Each structure stands twice: as structure tokens, then as C-alpha cells.
């Protein structure tokens, strides 16, 4: 996990186009018509982790191996969803514990453009200031979504610095990043916020919420995976 067959080239609003297939765990969650409503991350061949607010159902599909959503010829894997596991602690009012697991009906065929992201340990500590990356097909301007997968490097923010703006809206299962010239935006939800752990890309956050206009000078908020990974492991073990 966490090691792309195709290495990404570093250096979403104000982000940049990604090297095709360089973020193999990135998936697109679409309805039966092919309409993209959220992103997600493959954690293995049978499970996808996304945001709870995305409201995924078994009628939606997981699309893996995609780069250009405007390309009808591009080879991709449309995977059906067998069951949806929304974290029962998801707070629809505070948006805390914003995580959901998707169990695929048919396993994804891992390849050069389709593989898993690593999951952190509940005790992992990713220092504030750490430069991580987020990806997705969300708006590039706050408007239709870009056809090609976007990426952006951004720093993790300490809870103290994040709260300097969001105050008490920041809860224990949330982690902030951004306010650095880039910003996740509509369509990026459920997508990954990854940081390297011993050289391997690891899921530190899940795009959740933020500025109502996707301001690049405001902290972006993500579901803190370290606070939710035990729930993830328990769910996988029991299913």
C-alpha cells in the first residue's frame, strides 16, 4: 500500500493536474448515470473509505483507475457496492466522525493504476506543518468539475491554529490542513488527504468540510483518520 506504480509529480482550487494514474487509490463515487458526487480511497481490493456526508448507497458505484472523466474510451473499473457501513457515531449536526466504509460486491483488480493507500495507526502523530497532498475532481474555481484528476500539496495545521478561525466547530475526529493558497472544494468530499509515513503514502484525512466559498486562505477540515482507524479495522474484521 501507499506506493504508486506511477510516481506522482508534485509542485481542488489552485492545485495542479495529476500525472495519470499516480494516485491509484483515488476513486470516483458515481450514481447509476455516471454522475460524480464524491471521491474515495481504496484501502484494499474489497473496501473503499469515504465521507459519511456523501450519503453513498448500494445503488451508487465505485469507479477505479480513472483519470479523465471526460474520456469515454479510458479504461476504468466500475465496481458495484455490496454494503455501506456508515460510522454510527457520525454527527449530522457537528459533522464529527465523518467516515463511511464501502464493501464492494466484486473485488477491484489491482494494477499499475489501481491500488491501495496505507492506513495509519491510531497512535500515529503527523506533526503540524507536515506537507501532505489531497486529490480529487472537485471544482477548481468556486462552474463544472474538471475532467482530469487534480492534486495539491498543503500543510497540516495544529488544532490551535485551526481553531483560531473555526473555534469550537473543530471536533476530536477532525484535522485541518490548508489555508496555504489551495483548497478542497465541491466534489472533493470523501477523497484522500495523504502524508508519507516511512516513505509510504498514508491516509491522514478524508475531505469533509470548510469555507463555503472554498477560500484558499481558510483552513480546510478533514476527518482525522487516526481517530477513526480503529473503527475501520473493527468493521473490516467483522465483515
Amino acid at each position: 500500500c501507499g506506493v504508486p506504480a506511477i510516481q506522482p509529480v508534485l509542485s481542488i482550487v489552485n492545485g495542479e493536474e495529476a500525472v495519470p494514474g499516480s494516485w491509484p487509490w483515488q476513486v470516483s463515487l458515481q450514481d447509476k448515470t455516471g454522475f460524480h458526487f464524491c471521491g474515495g480511497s481504496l484501502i484494499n481490493e474489497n473496501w473503499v473509505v469515504t465521507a459519511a456526508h456523501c450519503g453513498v448507497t448500494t445503488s451508487d458505484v465505485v469507479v477505479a483507475g480513472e483519470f479523465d472523466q471526460g474520456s469515454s474510451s479510458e479504461k476504468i473499473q466500475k465496481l458495484k457496492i455490496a454494503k455501506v457501513f456508515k460510522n454510527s457515531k457520525y454527527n449530522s449536526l457537528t459533522i464529527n466522525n465523518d467516515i463511511t466504509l464501502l464493501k464492494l460486491s466484486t473485488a477491484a483488480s489491482f494494477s499499475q493504476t489501481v491500488s491501495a493507500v496505507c492506513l495509519p495507526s491510531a497512535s500515529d502523530d503527523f506533526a503540524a506543518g507536515t506537507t501532505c497532498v489531497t486529490t480529487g475532481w472537485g471544482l477548481t474555481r468556486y462552474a463544472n468539475t474538471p475532467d482530469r484528476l487534480q492534486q495539491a500539496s498543503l500543510p497540516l495545521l495544529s488544532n490551535t491554529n485551526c481553531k483560531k478561525y473555526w473555534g469550537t466547530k473543530i471536533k476530536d475526529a477532525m484535522i485541518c490542513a490548508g489555508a496555504s493558497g489551495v483548497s478542497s472544494c465541491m466534489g472533493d468530499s470523501g477523497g484522500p488527504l495523504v502524508c508519507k509515513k516511512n516513505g509510504a503514502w498514508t491516509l491522514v484525512g478524508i475531505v469533509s468540510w470548510g469555507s463555503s466559498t472554498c477560500s484558499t486562505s481558510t483552513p480546510g477540515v478533514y476527518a482525522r483518520v487516526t481517530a477513526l482507524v480503529n473503527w475501520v479495522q473493527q468493521t473490516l474484521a467483522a465483515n
Binding site: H53, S92, C185, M186, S189, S208
Partner: protein, 58 residues
Amino acid sequence: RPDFCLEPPYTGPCEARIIRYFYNAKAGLCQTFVYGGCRAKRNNFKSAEDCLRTCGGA
């Protein structure tokens, strides 16, 4: 009809791209809009029919 039917559509702070319907009093019909996935206001419906049954004529 409820006054919430007269409120403009509310995307919210979450970053999903979910299609929902809201009643547009200026046009007299329910239109689609992108909902972010959280903190929906009441003029937000999952189908045009639900919207028209709740806000039609406001």
C-alpha cells in the same frame, strides 16, 4: 406554503456534489442545485415531486 420555500438554495459547508431540488418562487417550479452533503435547509428535496408537493405555489 411554508416560508422556507422562499429561501434560496443552500449548498452548505461540506464538499460533496449531491444533486437536490429546491423550489424557485420566481419561476414557480422546482429546480436542481448542488448540495454539499451536510446542514441542509428545508428547501432541499431528493426529488422534484417531493419539492412540488411541499412548496408548489409558494
